[PDB]
Amino acid sequence: VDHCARHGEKLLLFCQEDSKVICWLCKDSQEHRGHHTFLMEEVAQEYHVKLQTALEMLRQKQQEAEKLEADIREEKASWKIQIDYDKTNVSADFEQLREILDWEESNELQNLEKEEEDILKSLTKSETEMVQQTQYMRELISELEHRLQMMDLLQGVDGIIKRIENMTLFRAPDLKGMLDMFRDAAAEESPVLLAMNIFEMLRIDEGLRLKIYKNTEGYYTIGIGHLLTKSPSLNAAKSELDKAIGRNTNGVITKDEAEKLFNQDVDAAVRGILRNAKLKPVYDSLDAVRRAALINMVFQMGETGVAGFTNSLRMLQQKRWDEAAVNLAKSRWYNQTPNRAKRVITTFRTGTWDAYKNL
Amino acid sequence: PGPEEGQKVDHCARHGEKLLLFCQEDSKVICWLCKDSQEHRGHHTFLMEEVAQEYHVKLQTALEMLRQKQQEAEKLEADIREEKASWKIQIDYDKTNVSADFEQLREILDWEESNELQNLEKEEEDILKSLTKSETEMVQQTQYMRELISELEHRLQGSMMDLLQGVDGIIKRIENMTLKKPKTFHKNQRRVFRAPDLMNIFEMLRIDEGLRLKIYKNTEGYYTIGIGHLLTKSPSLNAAKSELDKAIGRNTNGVITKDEAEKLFNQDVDAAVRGILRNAKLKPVYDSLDAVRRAALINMVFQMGETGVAGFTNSLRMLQQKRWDEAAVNLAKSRWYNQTPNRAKRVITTFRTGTWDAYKNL
Ligand SMILES: [Zn+2]
Ligand SMILES: [Zn+2]
Ligand SMILES: [Zn+2]
Ligand SMILES: [Zn+2]
């Protein structure tokens, strides 16, 4: 049950090298000569602590590894959208080319229908003209024919002698060529749908500011738009900061810390959405480029404040884009921060970072 | 009234005496008292009869000139009407020609688009391959550690021996821990394209059939060429240009030469003589007719075919009975006469008169 395998004795020792448990008879052998040993109790309670610490770190890395799972789980599904957009974009693009050809067709055709108007109008004119010149001839033949048959054929004839004596009568360019020119290159750049994130979003929307400033609303705030306190006391806001950073900041911080707060503010907001019953369903419904836009509206005016946009939360889940943009503009949130709301909407609209590529 | 006499003579309105004199120099007619008026006091007067046939001749000699100057005028009447349809063709050929080039291009797009989607699908396959790999390379890490943890969780409990046996290898491997990261394509270069921001037989026929070197419409709306050479009865132009090349033996592009026009003309006439001699309805007639009427017969078989002309029983019966007076009437009462009266007159004339009086003017 608990004895040395072979020697049949009590396992008391612990070789440092082998790191395995042995008995005193095991010690006097090949694999344990020159080896330092100890009794199990002399090393036990020390090792116990050593794994009590290994466990804790090993548990954090089990969270970090469970993030890398999610991380690429998102990227897969993201490309699925990236592709199934570049696809429509690429197709619809050609569709417009297929249109400009349809116009240029009937255009060039009516330029030939114009020649069938011009040359055809000089036709019926010089037709009727020389068609009477034919019957007017039968008018004189029938005349003389009955003029003959004396009173008839003489009533002025040396005039008709003078009458008869004066009877005078491709658009097609190398389209393949141009497409071969543009197919070459123009600007080979990174993706245009996941070359940015919720972080770079808010970095642009909130800016990074190291020393305490006042809000859009007037309140004290720091770093990547982290609210400190509604109070007018700069010190009180310094106090909250001092308390928030875990040192004596004095209303100014490192960028490294400015980031920490931001990661937390983001991540804290997210948990606010996962717990709120009205928000989450809309989150899971949207693509990444919009999943971030919800965090933005939450990061700004908090959980309870976004849940109120029920009229807007409906369309976006039903995915009526151009309309959800107009309904959000009627909320006070648009009135107060016009440019910010505009950028977030345009992102709820286009489903792209196009509202940010400027900045 | 009276026959073999002269019509009564009217009277000089200004004087009263009969109008009998032809004033030379004034070309008009007057009485004797009118010769004394100052209007003529110097003009050589003559009796109407003394000059009647001088002028009756002079008008006939002039009247014939009028008819022959009426033909060349009626020929320039058709000279225009021909050019009319000669452009109506030129357009309805350039019209289809362009709309066939605008299709060569729409084809070019279809293929380019096909080539572009065929690429956005290679990316998706390629990327969603390495991803679904490294993905499991993470399902490994996450699950693995959940088992590497359970090891410790097991040691931190139970026997001191369990806690201790081979414990170093673990605090080694855990200190030497570095979770790898997934193969992201977050920012690797890429390209999705940009749509840019944009007499006998042959002669008699040419007069009636004409000579065009390109595809023109018949007297019945069918595409023909040369001298009445039917390519097709279909209203398609592309259908004419296709059969045309099977005929000529080259790509004409809607235009042949004069020796190619005559090539297909001698193949049509040489068949008309056959179409008749191969027919037990017409051959009895063709043999019992002289050279001129034989042409008038071949003209009808060339115009309609051996089956069509063989539809004229009474006429062919009478032309065999040689009843010209009766036959010329039976050929007029026909759809052949209505569709082309001018040509019908010329053929029926060739049957009745037995001469070429129907082409001395054309
Ligand atoms: Zn032992
Ligand atoms: Zn040992
Ligand atoms: Zn008189
Ligand atoms: Zn006179």
XYZ file of C-alpha atoms and ligand atoms in Angstrom:
725
model
C 0.000 0.000 0.000
C 2.732 2.443 1.026
C 6.134 0.766 0.980
C 9.194 0.706 -1.242
C 8.418 -1.363 -4.349
C 11.272 -3.852 -3.994
C 13.042 -3.576 -0.635
C 9.704 -3.732 1.164
C 10.394 -0.845 3.524
C 9.076 2.573 4.530
C 9.207 5.407 2.007
C 10.503 8.317 4.082
C 12.936 10.152 1.851
C 12.953 12.563 -1.070
C 15.784 12.788 -3.572
C 16.414 16.327 -4.799
C 17.609 15.179 -8.226
C 15.132 12.387 -9.038
C 12.432 14.431 -7.310
C 10.867 11.059 -6.471
C 10.066 9.405 -3.138
C 12.272 6.542 -1.939
C 13.296 4.579 1.167
C 16.665 4.480 2.929
C 17.637 1.232 1.170
C 16.839 2.758 -2.217
C 19.304 5.533 -1.394
C 22.240 3.123 -1.382
C 22.025 2.289 -5.092
C 22.865 3.344 -8.656
C 20.286 6.045 -9.320
C 20.779 7.727 -5.941
C 24.503 7.878 -5.110
C 25.803 11.384 -4.498
C 22.167 12.455 -4.328
C 21.006 14.842 -1.638
C 17.915 13.576 0.177
C 15.506 14.759 2.865
C 12.559 13.487 4.885
C 9.222 14.182 3.233
C 8.075 16.577 5.978
C 11.201 18.702 5.691
C 10.249 19.560 2.095
C 6.487 18.868 2.004
C 4.791 21.945 3.514
C 7.198 24.140 1.500
C 6.340 22.488 -1.842
C 2.633 22.576 -0.972
C 2.830 26.369 -0.915
C 4.858 26.232 -4.125
C 1.991 24.545 -5.971
C -0.575 26.652 -4.130
C 0.975 29.488 -6.140
C 1.455 27.509 -9.357
C -2.234 26.631 -9.306
C -3.284 30.284 -9.106
C -1.130 31.428 -12.039
C -2.011 28.304 -13.977
C -5.656 29.276 -13.469
C -5.131 32.721 -14.963
C -3.462 31.240 -18.028
C -6.489 28.980 -18.334
C -8.518 32.195 -18.732
C -6.011 33.694 -21.169
C -6.098 30.507 -23.231
C -9.901 30.554 -23.160
C -9.669 34.069 -24.631
C -7.491 32.974 -27.552
C -10.257 30.469 -28.243
C -12.873 33.229 -28.480
C -10.374 35.551 -30.193
C -10.019 33.466 -33.351
C -13.616 32.179 -33.112
C -14.434 35.811 -33.849
C -11.911 36.168 -36.650
C -13.267 33.149 -38.504
C -16.836 34.480 -38.426
C -15.472 37.933 -39.259
C -13.852 36.884 -42.531
C -17.092 35.094 -43.308
C -18.651 38.573 -43.327
C -15.593 40.287 -44.822
C -15.738 37.914 -47.783
C -19.558 37.850 -48.098
C -19.370 41.641 -48.549
C -16.392 41.985 -50.870
C -18.385 39.446 -52.892
C -21.533 41.575 -53.194
C -19.385 44.691 -53.605
C -17.398 43.034 -56.389
C -20.509 41.721 -58.128
C -22.653 44.856 -57.824
C -19.658 46.851 -59.092
C -19.657 44.886 -62.337
C -23.438 45.305 -62.493
C -22.947 49.048 -62.873
C -20.333 48.429 -65.564
C -22.863 46.171 -67.262
C -25.178 49.202 -67.141
C -22.878 51.837 -68.654
C -22.480 49.441 -71.579
C -26.263 49.210 -72.004
C -26.509 52.998 -72.246
C -23.504 53.297 -74.556
C -25.200 50.658 -76.713
C -28.587 52.274 -77.359
C -26.717 55.573 -77.569
C -24.568 54.381 -80.459
C -27.636 52.723 -81.979
C -29.685 55.920 -82.026
C -26.743 57.680 -83.684
C -27.368 55.201 -86.493
C -31.111 55.725 -86.118
C -30.342 59.402 -86.727
C -28.675 58.549 -90.035
C -31.827 56.593 -90.844
C -33.648 59.871 -90.149
C -31.422 62.295 -92.068
C -30.718 60.280 -95.215
C -34.317 59.006 -95.200
C -35.781 62.532 -95.093
C -33.729 63.625 -98.104
C -35.345 60.554 -99.672
C -39.086 61.237 -99.646
C -38.360 64.836 -100.688
C -36.308 64.103 -103.816
C -38.786 61.247 -104.308
C -42.033 63.219 -104.578
C -40.073 65.819 -106.555
C -38.959 63.392 -109.272
C -42.193 61.375 -108.969
C -44.193 64.317 -110.309
C -41.456 64.776 -112.921
C -42.629 61.368 -114.140
C -46.364 62.100 -114.306
C -45.809 65.621 -115.611
C -44.155 63.715 -118.443
C -47.311 61.644 -118.960
C -49.140 64.979 -118.793
C -47.291 66.170 -121.907
C -47.446 62.791 -123.664
C -51.208 62.527 -123.127
C -51.397 66.189 -124.146
C -49.618 65.798 -127.486
C -51.315 62.437 -128.062
C -54.666 64.243 -128.063
C -53.206 67.468 -129.424
C -52.649 65.446 -132.589
C -55.543 63.131 -133.538
C -56.037 71.224 -137.470
C -57.468 73.587 -134.844
C -56.106 71.138 -132.295
C -52.485 70.624 -133.277
C -51.666 74.248 -134.188
C -53.041 76.522 -131.470
C -49.535 77.680 -130.548
C -46.930 75.022 -131.415
C -43.683 76.947 -131.962
C -43.694 77.292 -128.172
C -43.892 73.568 -127.350
C -40.922 73.128 -129.674
C -38.976 75.261 -127.183
C -40.410 73.379 -124.182
C -39.045 70.080 -125.485
C -35.865 71.783 -126.712
C -35.264 72.767 -123.087
C -36.482 69.566 -121.460
C -33.557 69.246 -119.051
C -33.862 66.513 -116.417
C -17.599 51.592 -84.666
C -17.325 52.030 -80.894
C -15.439 49.128 -79.291
C -12.336 49.823 -77.178
C -9.961 47.208 -75.758
C -12.049 46.831 -72.604
C -9.922 43.844 -71.625
C -6.960 46.205 -71.896
C -8.210 48.736 -69.352
C -9.181 46.037 -66.864
C -5.710 44.537 -67.280
C -4.280 47.922 -66.333
C -6.340 48.334 -63.151
C -5.915 44.639 -62.314
C -2.192 45.326 -62.036
C -2.297 47.521 -58.930
C -3.333 50.844 -57.410
C -3.169 50.424 -53.634
C -2.661 46.970 -52.095
C -3.618 47.572 -48.464
C -4.877 45.708 -45.383
C -8.534 44.665 -44.874
C -11.155 47.421 -44.660
C -13.534 45.789 -42.179
C -11.305 44.413 -39.409
C -8.335 46.779 -39.697
C -9.674 48.466 -36.548
C -11.512 47.597 -33.307
C -13.632 48.869 -30.413
C -10.418 50.193 -28.874
C -9.177 52.194 -31.870
C -12.801 53.241 -32.199
C -12.946 54.901 -28.789
C -9.343 56.090 -28.958
C -10.592 58.271 -31.819
C -13.945 59.089 -30.223
C -12.651 59.874 -26.700
C -9.003 60.741 -27.294
C -6.226 59.896 -24.840
C -5.571 62.609 -22.256
C -3.008 62.122 -19.457
C -3.819 65.064 -17.144
C -7.325 65.549 -15.701
C -9.622 67.614 -17.938
C -13.325 68.482 -17.955
C -15.973 66.479 -19.798
C -18.246 67.382 -22.704
C -20.755 67.637 -19.878
C -18.288 69.529 -17.663
C -17.293 66.734 -15.279
C -13.720 65.693 -14.443
C -12.341 62.889 -16.601
C -8.992 61.357 -17.528
C -7.247 59.199 -20.089
C -9.342 57.451 -22.702
C -12.539 59.174 -21.564
C -12.758 57.742 -18.038
C -15.271 59.578 -15.829
C -13.978 60.430 -12.343
C -16.668 62.327 -10.448
C -19.527 64.770 -10.965
C -18.150 66.886 -8.103
C -16.624 70.304 -8.879
C -13.654 69.549 -6.607
C -10.562 68.944 -8.735
C -9.078 67.419 -5.589
C -12.026 65.076 -5.133
C -11.476 64.005 -8.715
C -7.776 63.710 -7.938
C -8.768 61.624 -4.929
C -10.852 59.233 -7.027
C -7.970 59.060 -9.486
C -5.441 58.435 -6.688
C -7.823 55.731 -5.490
C -8.363 54.454 -9.026
C -4.715 54.231 -10.079
C -3.401 52.914 -6.774
C -0.845 55.664 -6.196
C -0.410 59.409 -5.677
C -1.241 60.646 -9.172
C -2.080 64.300 -8.446
C -4.341 64.519 -11.488
C -1.867 63.165 -14.023
C -0.952 59.638 -15.107
C 1.220 57.543 -17.409
C -0.077 56.384 -20.795
C 0.403 52.824 -19.541
C -2.092 53.485 -16.768
C -4.364 55.492 -19.059
C -4.619 52.247 -21.017
C -5.321 50.070 -17.979
C -8.317 52.226 -17.112
C -9.522 51.974 -20.677
C -9.313 48.187 -20.874
C -11.317 48.126 -17.644
C -13.853 50.724 -18.786
C -14.415 48.761 -21.984
C -14.517 45.366 -20.283
C -16.670 46.740 -17.467
C -19.146 48.165 -19.950
C -19.346 44.844 -21.810
C -20.367 43.047 -18.623
C -23.011 45.753 -18.275
C -24.422 44.639 -21.617
C -24.233 40.915 -20.895
C -26.268 41.433 -17.722
C -28.800 43.868 -19.202
C -31.773 41.924 -20.563
C -32.703 44.440 -23.280
C -29.253 44.900 -24.807
C -27.642 41.457 -25.190
C -30.050 40.051 -27.819
C -29.130 42.961 -30.077
C -25.429 42.362 -29.456
C -25.413 38.745 -30.642
C -27.429 39.784 -33.698
C -24.922 42.252 -35.158
C -21.579 41.882 -36.928
C -18.307 42.836 -35.213
C -18.143 46.269 -36.866
C -21.468 47.043 -35.169
C -20.929 44.976 -32.027
C -18.303 47.604 -31.241
C -20.727 50.447 -31.998
C -23.037 49.199 -29.263
C -20.154 49.154 -26.763
C -19.465 52.754 -27.804
C -22.992 53.936 -26.972
C -22.741 51.984 -23.706
C -19.222 53.194 -22.890
C -20.570 56.722 -23.295
C -23.963 56.921 -21.564
C -24.017 53.623 -19.654
C -26.248 50.535 -19.676
C -29.588 51.932 -18.545
C -29.246 54.779 -21.042
C -28.891 52.590 -24.133
C -31.729 50.209 -23.236
C -34.089 53.146 -23.751
C -33.489 53.196 -27.511
C -36.065 50.414 -27.930
C -37.283 51.942 -31.201
C -33.713 51.829 -32.498
C -32.781 48.481 -30.927
C -35.573 46.953 -33.015
C -34.569 48.024 -36.545
C -30.907 47.148 -36.011
C -31.857 43.643 -34.910
C -34.274 43.425 -37.841
C -31.292 44.944 -39.659
C -33.053 47.912 -41.259
C -29.966 50.095 -41.560
C -30.781 53.358 -43.365
C -33.861 53.754 -41.141
C -32.177 53.051 -37.785
C -29.836 55.938 -38.620
C -32.776 58.347 -38.889
C -34.488 57.135 -35.705
C -31.324 57.532 -33.618
C -30.972 61.126 -34.807
C -34.246 61.977 -33.052
C -32.870 61.068 -29.612
C -31.307 63.598 -27.244
C -28.066 61.607 -27.477
C -27.681 62.850 -31.046
C -28.466 66.454 -30.096
C -25.752 66.653 -27.438
C -22.900 64.892 -29.284
C -23.679 65.383 -33.022
C -20.377 64.304 -34.583
C -19.928 61.344 -32.230
C -23.460 60.038 -32.745
C -23.007 60.579 -36.485
C -19.875 58.397 -36.554
C -21.443 55.620 -34.484
C -24.611 55.618 -36.607
C -22.728 55.645 -39.927
C -21.011 52.551 -38.483
C -24.375 51.004 -37.583
C -25.305 51.931 -41.146
C -22.445 51.043 -43.500
C -21.165 48.258 -41.259
C -17.659 49.571 -41.923
C -15.005 51.808 -40.335
C -15.679 54.402 -43.068
C -16.801 56.865 -40.383
C -13.272 56.753 -38.933
C -10.825 56.274 -41.815
C -10.835 60.071 -41.996
C -9.434 60.465 -38.476
C -72.014 65.000 -137.592
C -70.763 63.183 -140.736
C -67.782 60.851 -141.365
C -64.755 61.478 -143.622
C -65.239 65.245 -143.362
C -64.022 68.297 -141.453
C -65.164 69.759 -138.139
C -66.945 73.110 -138.337
C -64.761 76.213 -138.175
C -65.132 78.737 -135.362
C -65.041 82.478 -135.989
C -62.439 85.146 -135.201
C -64.051 86.737 -132.167
C -62.534 90.151 -132.885
C -63.751 90.317 -136.515
C -66.248 87.631 -137.466
C -64.678 85.917 -140.454
C -63.701 82.233 -140.197
C -60.473 81.121 -138.536
C -58.579 79.422 -141.351
C -55.100 80.956 -141.407
C -52.003 79.867 -139.482
C -49.856 82.882 -138.704
C -46.179 82.006 -139.003
C -43.904 84.025 -136.670
C -46.792 84.215 -134.134
C -47.466 80.481 -134.152
C -51.189 81.241 -133.540
C -54.356 81.106 -135.694
C -56.502 83.868 -137.215
C -58.961 85.012 -139.909
C -58.217 87.081 -143.003
C -59.333 90.385 -141.467
C -56.973 89.553 -138.627
C -54.020 89.510 -141.051
C -54.629 93.215 -141.659
C -54.530 94.095 -137.963
C -51.253 95.642 -136.818
C -50.661 92.694 -134.497
C -49.655 90.658 -137.574
C -49.033 93.329 -140.244
C -45.902 91.634 -141.599
C -46.381 87.940 -140.855
C -46.392 85.101 -143.339
C -49.911 83.682 -143.162
C -50.765 80.198 -144.453
C -53.840 78.028 -144.701
C -54.204 75.488 -141.886
C -54.097 72.570 -144.300
C -50.939 73.851 -146.007
C -49.009 73.360 -142.745
C -51.012 70.773 -140.780
C -48.851 67.796 -141.762
C -45.652 69.848 -141.544
C -46.274 70.073 -137.806
C -48.126 66.782 -137.242
C -44.876 65.114 -138.301
C -42.760 67.530 -136.264
C -44.689 66.615 -133.094
C -44.479 62.856 -133.622
C -40.724 63.149 -134.208
C -40.774 65.143 -130.972
C -43.372 63.006 -129.200
C -41.174 59.935 -129.462
C -38.344 61.903 -127.870
C -40.662 62.733 -124.968
C -41.350 59.043 -124.289
C -37.646 58.178 -124.367
C -36.931 61.145 -122.106
C -39.728 59.860 -119.864
C -37.995 56.509 -119.414
C -34.641 57.925 -118.292
C -36.613 60.123 -115.895
C -38.678 57.199 -114.622
C -35.355 55.343 -114.307
C -33.943 58.102 -112.102
C -37.186 57.706 -110.146
C -36.132 54.175 -109.235
C -32.455 55.180 -109.045
C -33.417 57.081 -105.899
C -35.810 54.482 -104.456
C -32.989 51.952 -104.726
C -30.522 54.101 -102.815
C -33.299 54.457 -100.224
C -33.358 50.766 -99.376
C -29.585 50.656 -99.921
C -29.165 52.727 -96.757
C -32.040 51.077 -94.878
C -29.907 47.972 -95.275
C -26.604 49.660 -94.392
C -28.160 50.717 -91.079
C -29.961 47.467 -90.238
C -26.559 45.796 -90.688
C -24.489 48.313 -88.740
C -27.320 48.220 -86.194
C -26.918 44.487 -85.605
C -23.135 44.658 -85.997
C -22.704 47.089 -83.096
C -25.139 45.200 -80.849
C -22.954 42.133 -81.502
C -19.825 43.959 -80.339
C -21.579 45.239 -77.221
C -22.211 41.543 -76.527
C -18.559 40.599 -77.008
C -17.892 43.085 -74.223
C -20.640 41.971 -71.841
C -19.070 38.542 -72.254
C -15.708 40.029 -71.265
C -17.225 41.410 -68.058
C -19.001 38.153 -67.156
C -15.668 36.351 -67.302
C -13.780 39.011 -65.343
C -16.474 38.992 -62.657
C -16.308 35.189 -62.661
C -12.571 35.435 -62.137
C -12.941 37.903 -59.270
C -15.524 35.978 -57.252
C -13.509 32.832 -57.938
C -10.752 34.612 -55.989
C -12.723 35.932 -53.019
C -13.690 32.288 -52.565
C -10.090 31.067 -52.616
C -9.289 33.501 -49.829
C -12.247 32.343 -47.758
C -11.201 28.722 -48.252
C -7.515 29.469 -47.571
C -8.078 31.649 -44.497
C -10.864 29.496 -43.021
C -8.407 26.587 -43.268
C -5.439 27.859 -41.279
C -7.891 29.447 -38.851
C -9.822 26.245 -38.148
C -6.376 24.735 -37.508
C -4.854 27.253 -35.080
C -8.341 27.386 -33.601
C -7.982 23.802 -32.397
C -4.386 24.682 -31.500
C -6.189 26.853 -28.944
C -8.832 24.294 -27.969
C -5.737 22.281 -27.115
C -4.248 24.941 -24.825
C -7.523 25.777 -23.034
C -8.509 22.150 -22.407
C -4.932 21.069 -21.745
C -4.427 23.509 -18.870
C -7.822 22.554 -17.442
C -6.195 19.119 -17.090
C -2.790 20.441 -16.026
C -4.676 22.334 -13.320
C -6.613 19.252 -12.167
C -3.181 17.679 -11.625
C -2.210 20.338 -9.090
C -5.752 20.419 -7.642
C -5.219 16.698 -7.048
C -1.789 17.140 -5.465
C -2.995 19.941 -3.158
C -4.951 17.233 -1.357
C -4.476 13.653 -0.219
C -1.192 11.877 0.432
C 1.970 13.848 1.106
C 3.647 11.283 -1.127
C 1.348 12.027 -4.075
C 2.029 15.735 -3.582
C 5.765 15.016 -3.700
C 6.530 12.196 -6.143
C 8.002 13.774 -9.290
C 6.737 17.228 -8.311
C 9.748 19.111 -9.727
C 9.002 18.228 -13.344
C 5.740 20.109 -12.982
C 6.932 23.294 -11.253
C 9.515 23.215 -14.054
C 7.086 22.860 -16.955
C 4.681 25.435 -15.499
C 7.415 28.028 -14.996
C 8.411 27.248 -18.577
C 4.902 28.042 -19.809
C 4.220 30.145 -22.876
C 0.823 29.876 -24.540
C 1.162 30.439 -28.286
C -1.183 32.785 -30.170
C -3.430 32.173 -33.198
C -2.549 32.869 -36.831
C -4.379 36.168 -37.287
C -4.672 37.814 -40.703
C -5.660 41.056 -38.961
C -3.500 43.283 -41.147
C -1.775 41.251 -43.863
C -2.057 42.975 -47.240
C -5.010 42.212 -49.497
C -6.807 43.464 -52.615
C -10.423 43.673 -53.761
C -10.741 45.253 -57.195
C -12.048 48.738 -58.020
C -14.550 49.200 -60.846
C -13.129 52.199 -62.811
C -15.080 55.490 -63.120
C -16.363 55.660 -66.711
C -32.164 39.347 -125.848
C -32.391 36.178 -123.741
C -32.843 34.921 -120.164
C -30.007 36.476 -118.140
C -30.382 40.047 -119.432
C -34.171 40.056 -119.125
C -33.853 39.062 -115.466
C -31.263 41.628 -114.329
C -33.609 44.358 -115.539
C -36.379 42.856 -113.397
C -34.157 41.516 -110.587
C -31.430 44.164 -110.431
C -27.887 43.816 -109.079
C -26.937 44.490 -105.455
C -23.629 43.220 -104.064
C -24.831 43.135 -100.439
C -27.792 41.655 -98.556
C -31.045 43.402 -99.547
C -34.735 42.605 -99.011
C -36.857 40.981 -101.733
C -40.219 42.094 -103.115
C -41.636 40.103 -100.194
C -39.381 41.150 -97.311
C -36.989 38.205 -97.604
C -33.217 38.691 -97.578
C -31.721 38.171 -101.042
C -28.530 39.077 -102.920
C -27.057 39.422 -106.407
C -29.869 38.850 -108.902
C -32.782 37.346 -106.978
C -30.770 34.770 -105.046
C -32.831 33.854 -101.983
C -30.573 33.255 -98.965
C -33.394 32.758 -96.462
C -37.032 33.616 -95.762
C -36.133 34.355 -92.129
C -36.172 38.026 -91.035
C -32.773 37.660 -89.338
C -29.776 39.355 -90.955
C -27.268 37.112 -89.181
C -29.180 34.217 -90.741
C -28.537 35.673 -94.196
C -24.829 36.315 -93.640
C -24.374 32.702 -92.506
C -26.067 30.941 -95.427
C -24.356 33.440 -97.725
C -20.925 32.066 -96.832
C -22.032 28.457 -97.243
C -23.084 29.593 -100.706
C -20.097 31.718 -101.742
C -17.544 29.642 -99.822
C -15.929 32.449 -97.837
C -16.621 35.090 -95.190
C -18.249 37.916 -97.126
C -19.319 40.033 -94.144
C -22.436 41.046 -96.064
C -20.823 41.878 -99.409
C -19.695 39.921 -102.493
C -18.051 40.751 -105.832
C -19.676 41.011 -109.280
C -18.286 37.642 -110.394
C -19.597 36.077 -107.189
C -22.969 37.692 -107.853
C -22.931 36.225 -111.354
C -21.608 32.968 -109.887
C -24.812 32.501 -107.890
C -26.805 33.899 -110.822
C -25.673 31.231 -113.280
C -26.422 28.582 -110.651
C -30.009 29.872 -110.417
C -30.835 30.212 -114.118
C -29.166 26.902 -114.972
C -31.555 25.401 -112.410
C -34.631 27.148 -113.815
C -34.142 25.309 -117.101
C -33.824 22.130 -115.033
C -36.807 22.951 -112.826
C -38.859 23.045 -116.023
C -37.465 20.026 -117.862
C -37.776 18.024 -114.636
C -41.505 18.823 -114.507
C -44.171 16.847 -116.373
C -46.435 19.914 -116.150
C -44.043 22.520 -117.534
C -41.819 20.490 -119.884
C -44.773 19.781 -122.200
C -45.120 23.580 -122.454
C -41.419 24.501 -122.598
C -40.891 22.193 -125.580
C -44.013 23.406 -127.400
C -42.924 27.053 -127.094
C -40.467 29.090 -129.158
C -37.285 30.714 -127.804
C -38.892 33.982 -126.668
C -41.847 32.432 -124.839
C -39.456 29.888 -123.332
C -37.724 32.803 -121.593
C -41.052 34.209 -120.430
C -41.687 30.753 -118.972
C -38.286 30.503 -117.278
C -38.909 33.995 -115.914
C -41.962 32.694 -114.058
C -40.222 29.568 -112.768
C -37.312 31.724 -111.602
C -39.796 34.000 -109.839
C -41.933 31.393 -108.058
C -40.540 27.903 -108.704
C -41.572 24.773 -110.590
C -44.415 24.103 -108.152
C -45.771 27.640 -108.440
C -45.809 28.027 -112.220
C -47.335 24.552 -112.377
C -50.279 26.122 -110.547
C -51.320 27.908 -113.747
C -53.308 25.195 -115.525
C -55.485 27.215 -117.917
C -52.715 29.624 -118.920
C -50.200 26.828 -119.538
C -53.029 24.952 -121.244
C -53.692 27.906 -123.547
C -50.025 28.727 -124.172
C -49.800 25.100 -125.293
C -52.974 25.565 -127.322
C -51.143 28.742 -128.382
C -54.270 30.781 -127.646
C -52.427 34.068 -127.114
C -55.560 36.235 -126.933
C -57.102 33.970 -124.294
C -53.887 33.224 -122.387
C -52.759 36.834 -121.922
C -56.051 37.439 -120.101
C -55.704 34.428 -117.796
C -52.226 35.499 -116.654
C -53.426 38.975 -115.679
C -56.065 37.595 -113.316
C -53.520 36.307 -110.790
C -51.644 37.221 -107.605
C -48.545 37.268 -109.814
C -49.948 40.275 -111.676
C -50.952 42.241 -108.574
C -47.660 41.833 -106.723
C -45.644 42.995 -109.740
C -47.850 44.529 -112.476
C -44.915 46.200 -114.246
C -42.988 42.937 -114.502
C -46.238 41.096 -115.205
C -46.978 43.412 -118.135
C -43.477 42.743 -119.447
C -43.838 38.954 -119.231
C -47.418 38.855 -120.531
C -46.257 41.173 -123.318
C -43.452 38.711 -124.085
C -46.083 35.963 -124.399
C -48.666 37.866 -126.453
C -46.519 40.043 -128.722
C -43.852 37.370 -129.135
C -41.184 40.087 -129.253
C -39.159 42.236 -126.837
C -41.326 45.365 -127.028
C -41.510 45.225 -123.225
C -37.798 46.024 -122.827
C -36.915 48.282 -125.773
C -37.594 51.199 -123.432
C -35.971 49.783 -120.277
Zn 13.603 0.990 -1.571
Zn 18.080 10.081 -6.300
Zn -59.195 88.263 -137.160
Zn -48.967 87.341 -136.984
